[PDB]
Symmetry: C4
């Protein structure tokens, strides 16, 4: 299973099949192996369970040496040693370059600059081994508890595993991905609040019961772990939201300093999260802002030249019925694409129109999109012929004595004459989305294409 | 009648009347029709009444039987006329009354079923968006205040929901001694006071001021105020972020003007510019752009040909005609805007058209010639500027292409 | 006298000033000195009223003392005077000299700018109401309605902001950090005025309802305390509502207090939120070229990572950027483009005459095409160790050394290999860069085209 | 060592010692190493006094013992030496901060009380007020730190960002404890009022530890806008001090949060500039109706061409100088363009010009690169991926990195003899025929060599 390649992500990370096979011959543990996926899924599950339950067990409750908590801790930590020794035989992507690092020497030397020390200190049963090497009892309990808090260093594993797997899975960068990111931020913040509540319940217990503690004043001595956890989370979330100090203001120096640090970090983190979410939602609403800026610049330009209200209203109508209220660019998007994709776009969008009438593939590279408005002349009499048109969605009425009122439907074509002084003229009935072809473009595309131009001229 | 026949908001969707007859066969095959507009308006009024009345009735005052049955009739009209199907299927029928047919806990079940009736706010969300672009006034500061007031509006109905919920939860489970009601002794006071205190706790929790006159004691109070605080603060913070972003976007053009002037400040810092020029540059930007930015070239090259023709005509018809439509029009299509500054020398291969201001001519023979709006000069193939002129330019080369492109009387023009 | 004859702000917007006189010779101009001083007198007197009236009408119960009445009536006389002077005045709006000398024109324009508010604020509605009541002749109701109708005078905020805006659009000479501080202190002034008004209201709303036991005045034992020791705590509650600190000493109890607290939380916190957003926007707009430089460097580093460049180049490019743009943007081509001619040639002259005129060929000739080719010059920045030109390479680009000394050693004002342009072939000199030499450049094509367009020399 | 010749990052400013020799030729230098050591000791002693002076003034009533006198006189002497060292350029500085530096450096309070020796208690109050006004090392520290910003900086990445927020929070905690000591000092100077908060809290004779750790709590509660403290102000000098504390704390915290959020947002800017472009393109496909397959095959092209890494190749190349563009293009393309035999014998100048005429191009698997019967227009130097060339009765021949397909019709014409197809995301380097023609017409040295 160490050989990578799964249609869920490998076929998207590597569009062609062969590249995926190339990954396989790279082996001839891999980052993209399915066994790695299963291992990291089980990891995330069990280790998030640890990050949630360990602060509850070690801060609240008594008689920690009971069988269920002990066996849970030892099995989790043994899995942690397993993945720790696995980290000495693995591979990661470096600076986005796909490097297998199947050599243990490399995955040791270059890993000797990572956070390996954090994983070392976290993934060893410090509480048990420190108790054994020592073997004042309350003081030893204090050390073993405060070092048991070091099991929460698995947040580093969580964040690194998320970072290596944030880019693997995507569906659509719309509200679906944005809500995923904001939900991840909210989950991290509630994890922080849970940790802070457990800390504010444990620091009194670590000192043993004070008389100047929030626990004594609130009489939360021997009621329940559920209510105590609920009220500690209450204090932590009130601190970050800046509601207050719960029921009573701090009374003891220990709790004064504790609430000071808790509320400073909570307020700072809440402000950071709120600003990040606001920036994310503005990025979601980015498409409207560009159009708003362009329209405000247009309005200021019209005011700078003192245009009459009729022209201003016509300009407003043209802008609202050209860009449809949110902005895009023809030139840049058609210039930042490879040849096959550009020809695919110009074929699908603009081939049915020409098919209603390799020269064509070279003529299609000169069709300029163009939108007019009702009542506006397209071609005017007395104007030298310089352009034709290819209706994509519009109805143009020819102005002629014979052609009193016509409605040219989709896929029509006019102005072709004088290509090879307009005889007539046409208006716009509805919102017509024309195309265009300058006579110079036709002359060029023809003169680099002579081997059929010798019959085109006829 | 499915025929819209609207010349006020359907005219914005389709400017010409002809498309109206097109919409005619669109009927013969409507969201913009009169009947749908009337139905949506009546349903909108009734559902606003729903959102601001039913939470009051379900929580307080444990008549109203008249209002709920008639409301359900119009909801059924929506479903038969009709993405979000189970939501309407649940919050479109009298679930509370029909639940008793299936069956104190039962009575409580009817109310929590009625709590699902609020989901039409989602229908309002979709509706309020699709009325947003059909009609508009302008993009001035006034419309922004309207948007902010509407934002405050749905956040305030959210406050109403939150207060009703915060009064209901300690009311469903009788009234425990640890509930905020028991602590405030306001068990049997007036409806006004109860609603005021509920909306007050909700207001404080979202606005992060306090809990009120007390602090949560029972587990129900703690957890209720818990989620109240988190959701209220979060939603209010995003609301304020959106409002401030919109306000800052209102005066955008001034912002880009300021950033461009800051970049010019850096540029003048680099080249050790003398203070006189460092002040003249500031004045020239204060009057050329008037502290608010635009780009004439991009806008002109972006507009459709008839529109661009309209603006260029309205700007320069009197200017050029003061010296065939096609030749003069092509000449107009090549005028550049060259706002000058007082005391700046002007001029010889270019001619100048003065739209605004006063220009002076310096010569040794005659003392000067005073010119005004519309006068043409520089016609060859030095002079000063007195006021903040807005001269127009005609480069000789551009004149050459304008002449050569039309050969009907080209040799006559060069003659 | 009514003619605008100032030499401070009318100068900024010279013969046009005489044209301003012309627009008055057709007969008060908004830019007139007397108008400006009179508007300043209203500025002071408006600030005074907006502070005193809410305190006077709320505090100092049974306000039958004479000096307050004298001050109020004289202020009302100034208000009638300035309202009637608002008739037949020039209003420069839309950056256009709309002097509207026509009485109908000034009438309609003033009727387009909160006319009815101006009348209702200017007229002493309290005095007229009391005099008509005395002419006519529930007593306590009339007593409270006296203060209620005197409260109509707070509509003068609209006039105050209108006058300051008529001056805000004039005083815009600075847009540096000083202007940001001016905007910030204006925001703080408006916010503190709202604090003062909310504090006065926190007492007025109870006061107009006498003093019920549920009001905070009763519970705080502040019924009989001094006026200062009441205003201070009222403003304390106003700021405690605005800043979202708390309800004050004790939570709201009565329905009136609860609803007033709700309204104060809204009008307080929302306005403070807009204030904070404005402050953050201004402090970020203070430093923007640094942000743009950071974005450009991030894009360049991102591109450099895209091409898997060796670390030596990844250090050389970083050094080049930090010693070329040095954390602050400058786009020479665009800035020069969007400048009118005379400023452009002035900048180019001051930059380039001493540098380029060192060698004799262009110095001898007439400086018109010389100025043109100077405007055609380009900015180039080099780094030590990189050879500017190579031996056995076609010499086509001269260099005018504005700064630094590079290798013989050439000091500032020298020139690099100008003989290559007039000759042709491969240059045999490999000049070595030794300093951060900011040079100037051109091309042989530019030289050929300037000699073609100007073949006189 | 009063000259800036140093063997550290100062060299990064001025590479060659001859460039450094210019400053040695001109030349106390602020950039000198001795001034560097003096600035570090200034920083250390300045932060020490900025933490200790407000506490020494307020809680330590009549600290007439010798240690405090020694501390104060050492500070006075060292600040005076710093002032006299900080002194041609003085006239430019003359209208700046000499009143500031004079009042900050000298012991105004101590010299004031010497000439004096209920007037005595008022003199003590004046001494305390003068020593408080002497705290202008806030401004001094701001100046000296702001000097360092231009002096040295490695990168503006996340590493420096967290440092910037840490600096802001350190300055803000400086403000916190200043306000904490103030909230005790102002009531203390009046003598403990009955209605004051200290009296209500019974914190009248408690130790320095409590009187500091709860005053700090009170003074940064108003900063985090959490509340007042144990009680409402009650006292009215107290409520005015609460006015000032509320305003300054909330306003400064608002500015600090705005600045920090803006920094963390500008930290990730390229991703935003790519997301905006992708939203624009998404609207482009929404406008001209297209099948979902084309939408997917454009999304894939962006995800494997820009990779979410938003950069503009033309602008980045242009804004660089030629003696820096040359190394980039060389490292990217010397192996590729020297691979084919015809250009291996080409002139280095001709090679570099052809490199400057090279253009980056990307393709997708299954998409034709060159077709059958089309007019040949460009040339290709494959840099990545594998390409499948199909030439009539030919199987899927697979060229690799460094190869070249399309070299035909480099100067000739005719229809395409073969059709190629991309097997992977082959990142090519295109090369148009007209560019080849123009480089040969401006380098006619080997026109006759390439004529064959
Ligand atoms: C009163 O101070 C602020 C208020 C607002 C804003 C900014 C403020 O300070 C940064 C804008 C905003 O997002 N908010 C944040 C609201 C979040 N909390 C709940 C508001 C209150 C608690 C908090 C947190 C603060 O710091 C961010 C703060 O600074 C004085 C004020 C407050 C809404 C209005």
């Amino acid at each position: 299973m160490l050989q990578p390649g799964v249609n869920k992500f490998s076929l998207r990370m590597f569009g062609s099949q062969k590249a995926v096979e190339r990954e396989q011959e790279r082996v001839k543990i891999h980052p993209y192996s399915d066994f790695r996926f299963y291992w990291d899924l089980t990891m995330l599950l069990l280790m998030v369970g640890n990050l949630i339950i360990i602060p509850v067990g070690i801060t609240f409750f008594k008689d920690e040496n009971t069988t269920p908590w002990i066996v849970f801790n030892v099995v989790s930590d043994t899995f942690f040693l397993i993945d720790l020794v696995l980290n000495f035989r693995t591979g990661i992507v470096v600076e986005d370059n796909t490097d297998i690092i199947l050599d243990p020497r490399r995955i040791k030397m270059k890993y000797l600059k990572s956070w390996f020390v954090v994983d070392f200190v976290s993934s060893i049963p410090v509480d048990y081994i420190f108790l054994i090497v020592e073997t004042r009892a309350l003081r030893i309990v204090r050390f073993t508890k405060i070092l048991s808090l070091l099991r929460l260093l698995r947040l580093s594993r969580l964040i690194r595993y998320i970072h290596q797997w944030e880019e693997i899975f995507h569906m659509t960068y719309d509200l679906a991905s944005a809500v995923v990111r904001i939900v991840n931020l909210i989950g991290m913040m509630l994890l922080l609040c849970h940790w802070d509540g457990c800390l504010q319940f444990l620091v009194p217990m670590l000192q043993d019961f004070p008389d100047d503690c929030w626990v004594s004043l609130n009489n939360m001595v021997n009621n329940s772990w559920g209510k105590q956890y609920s009220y500690a989370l209450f204090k932590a979330m009130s601190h970050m939201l800046c509601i207050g100090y719960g029921r009573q203001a701090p009374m003891g120096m220990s709790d004064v300093w504790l609430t000071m640090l808790s509320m400073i970090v909570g307020a700072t983190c809440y402000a950071m999260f709120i600003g990040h979410a606001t920036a994310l939602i503005q990025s979601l609403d980015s498409s409207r802002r560009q159009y708003q800026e362009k329209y405000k610049q247009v309005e200021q330009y019209m005011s700078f030249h003192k245009l009459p209200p009729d022209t201003r209203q016509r300009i407003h109508d043209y802008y609202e019925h050209r860009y449809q209220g949110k902005m895009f660019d023809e030139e840049s998007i058609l210039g930042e694409l490879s040849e096959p994709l550009r020809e695919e776009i110009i074929n699908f969008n603009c081939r049915k129109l020409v098919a209603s009438m390799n020269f064509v593939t070279s003529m299609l590279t000169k069709l300029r999109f163009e939108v007019f408005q009702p009542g506006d002349y397209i071609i005017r009499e007395g104007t030298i012929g310089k352009k034709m048109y290819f209706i994509q969605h519009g109805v143009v009425s020819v102005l002629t004595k014979g052609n009193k009122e016509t409605k040219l439907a989709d896929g029509s074509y006019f102005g072709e004459i004088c290509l090879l002084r307009r005889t007539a003229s046409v208006r716009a009935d509805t919102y017509c989305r024309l195309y265009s072809l300058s006579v110079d473009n036709f002359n060029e595309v023809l003169e680099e294409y002579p081997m059929m131009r010798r019959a085109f001229e006829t």
